[PDB]
């Protein structure tokens, strides 16, 4: 596109009980991107959030693995996790703390993966995983807040959601 | 009339030398009135002249870059809302941007501090009010204070 977005996409939208579907959170063409906070909701009776790297079930302090950006320790990346898996809420954030250094070097990290989250299927009921607004993030864009290397809030980007995990609609092929 | 008094403080570590500035400057206002004061260097506040018939009232507690807090008080006379050994706590990290706070502690606040990360008192770009623990440097200790109450709203007090 060249168009700016944050996107959550699954490797598959169908599965059997006990399969782990991988949700990958990406950013695309976010100018001078330096950090984010996101709020992602799911139905915890249908899916269980699991760490695809460690194999552990998500807890409140689990930061999702898998990023390909915001990895340069020269700029002091800081992870924050504040999930509530029992209520089907993932809420986490990461940024370079030393944004002035990042800006000075001038090598932008505008596209890549920021999180991978496993979702273990508990039952075959059609369900959605999505970015959603939260009272703890006033003025966010569907529960997403992206930051540039000036430390300012970025606006104007699309929020791409994954297709419905239509697990309750799995008929035999005709 | 009614007088209300108490102590306000913070829940983070700071250098003993900075106590005076840490504990002072918390604004306390009686909602619906012009009665207000600011805390002194021990975190003490006192507001006199509250109407005696005003048997229920709200104290609005605030400070630049702190998450505001409302405390409801029931009674008349000489009322004590907290003590020096168990003060009312206000959480640092609802940071002003262009003179405006949004009444939430979250990543927007972390990133405001990050604008002046690694600065020290004396530097052109050091901002005293963003040095949350008032130790003369803006760094990961200040960011960690914000993160301690990440996603907090005034209802979580
Ligand atoms: Ca705030
Ligand atoms: Ca400091």
Numbering used by the authors:
A (entry chain A): 16 to 189
B (entry chain B): 8 to 164
What sentences appear in the manuscript?
Primary scaffoldins, in addition to containing multiple type-I Cohs, have a divergent type-II Doc that binds to type-II Cohs located in cell-surface anchoring scaffoldins, providing a mechanism to tether the cellulosome to the bacterial cell envelope. In addition to ScaA, inspection of C. thermocellum genome revealed the presence of an ORF (Cthe_1806) encoding a protein comprising 2177 amino acids and containing a putative type-II Doc, which was termed CipB. Type-II Docs of primary scaffoldins ScaA and CipB in C. thermocellum possess two distinct Coh-binding surfaces that recognize different Coh partners.
Strikingly, the data revealed that the two Docs bound ScaF and ScaC2 in different orientations. The binding site for ScaF is located primarily in helix 3 of ScaA XDoc and helix 1 of CipB XDoc and is more polar. When CtCohScaF-XDocScaA and CtCohScaF-XDocCipB complexes were overlaid a high structural similarity between the Doc and Coh structures was observed (0.6 Å for 166 Cα atoms of the Coh alone and 1.0 Å for 55 Cα atoms of the Doc module). Doc residues that bind ScaF Coh were highly conserved with the exception of Val115 and Ser121 from CipB XDoc, which correspond to Gln145 and His151, respectively, in ScaA XDoc. ScaA XDoc makes two extra hydrogen bonds with the ScaF Coh through Asn122 and His151, which are compensated in the CipB XDoc-ScaF Coh complex by extra polar contacts established between the side chain of Arg104 of CipBXDoc with Gly166 of ScaF Coh. Inspection of the Coh-Doc interface when ScaF is the Coh partner reveals a much more extensive hydrogen-bonding network when compared to the complexes involving ScaC2 Coh. Binding to ScaF Coh involves the establishment of very important polar contacts between the side chains of Asn158/Asn122 with the Coh. To summarize, the structural and biochemical data here show that the ScaA and CipB XDoc modules bind to ScaC2 and ScaF Cohs in opposite orientations, and different helices thus dominate recognition of the different Cohs.
